[PDB]
Structures are given as C-alpha cells and as structure tokens.
Write a protein that binds this DNA or RNA. Sequence first.
DNA 1: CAGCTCTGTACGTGAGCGATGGACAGCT
DNA 2: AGCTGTCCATCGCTCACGTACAGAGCTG
Length: 198
Amino acid sequence: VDRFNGVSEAELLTKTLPDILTFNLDIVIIGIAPGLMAAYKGHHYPGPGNHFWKCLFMSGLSEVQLNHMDDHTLPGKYGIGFTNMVERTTPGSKDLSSKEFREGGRILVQKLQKYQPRIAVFNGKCIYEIFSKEVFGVKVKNLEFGLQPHKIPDTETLCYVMPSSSARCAQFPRAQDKVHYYIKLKDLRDQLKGIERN
DNA sequence: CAGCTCTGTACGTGAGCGATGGACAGCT
DNA sequence: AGCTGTCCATCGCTCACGTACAGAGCTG
C-alpha cells in the first residue's frame, strides 16, 4: 500500500534526481530515468531489489557492499559517476515517449562531450537502441550487450551496454545473471587505465 | 513475397508490505 | 486456569529505472 512514508506518487513525479558528474571519470553509469524511489531518496539506485549496488560489489568494482547513500563518494573513491537518458522521474521504462527519449539523447550526448568519461555505461539496452539511432545514425538488427563499436562523437569515450539493473526484467532474473557484464566492464576499465599508465 | 517498424504481451527472482495467528507473559 | 494483549514469524500478494518476441500493418 504505502511505499513512500506518506509522500504521494504525484509529488515524487515533480522531484528530480541530480546527476553526479565530474571530469576525469573512468565510468559514467547512465540510467533510463529515475524511478519513484530514486526521486524520493535523492540518491541513485535505492530500490531494495535493484541489482546495481549488489552487482558493483559482486564484480569487484567496490571492495565492500555499498548502497545508494554512497553515490556521491563514487567519483572520488571509485572514478564512477551517474546520469540518466531522461531527467524526468518516471515509474518505469514503458511510460517514456519517443520524443522524451530523443530529447534525452541530445542532452546526454552534450553531457558526455563535456565530462568525457573513459566509458559511457548504458544501464539498459532500450536506451542504447534509441541513442545509437539518434547519435550514430545506426540501427542494427541484433543489438548486443557489452562494448559497442562507436566512440561518443568528438571524444574517446567508449559505449558499453548492460541489461538494466532493475529487477523488472525476467531475462536476467538475478544480480548473478548480470554480474558477467560488470566484471567485463571492470576488465575494460583496468585495461584502459593500464594502457594509459604505460 | 519479405524485411521492416510498431504495438501488445508474457516472462523469473527476491524484497517488502499488510494480514494472520501461534507463542507467551502479565494479570487476576 | 482463564483471559487478554503484544510480539513477531510467516504467508500471500505485489512488483521493480525491462526485455524479447509474435504478429499486424506498412513498404519496397
């Protein structure tokens, strides 16, 4: 019944979740749109069932199990930042229109060209499908997860796609089913950093 | 025909919320 | 022993920042 401690869903729809972006980041996690719990909390991925923080720990991207309250520590401590394709608070990915997504893509690509992280991680396959068509003018028959073959225009930022950390998708039913992509992201990060160090 | 886009629908886990009722102590 | 109320284990149900895919409609 009451999931928001007496706060209405209509009020949460007016709230926004701030980005956590700085220069020289290794990774920027790009969500689809903040959900009601993130709007409520004012922090990234607070959903008790969301797999994000558990996959970050299980993959070794964090040495201890962190939570949504740690999100502002991620740039300085781990080289990780956060943004979303669509800024607007939304219950789920199915409530977003094509226009909202394409407006989001344009704003997103400008953010990435400003902050130029080593890797732009799309936390959700649906947003990369829109982004690729809008930014690179490419629609492939079978879009795959993992490292994509185009850099953000005018930057060296790579594009890496993972299934959404939301526990809504049945195709990757557990955090265990998504951790392969976080491990591969860690490996890609370590390789990029090692190449720059040498 | 055939390949495309668009829309509707079905799908596995694990966490939380409200209801239920057994266990149990305080009281007389 | 009988009564009463709280605690809390446990259950059923819902559902979470989606995704894959069939099939209708469209177009070359």
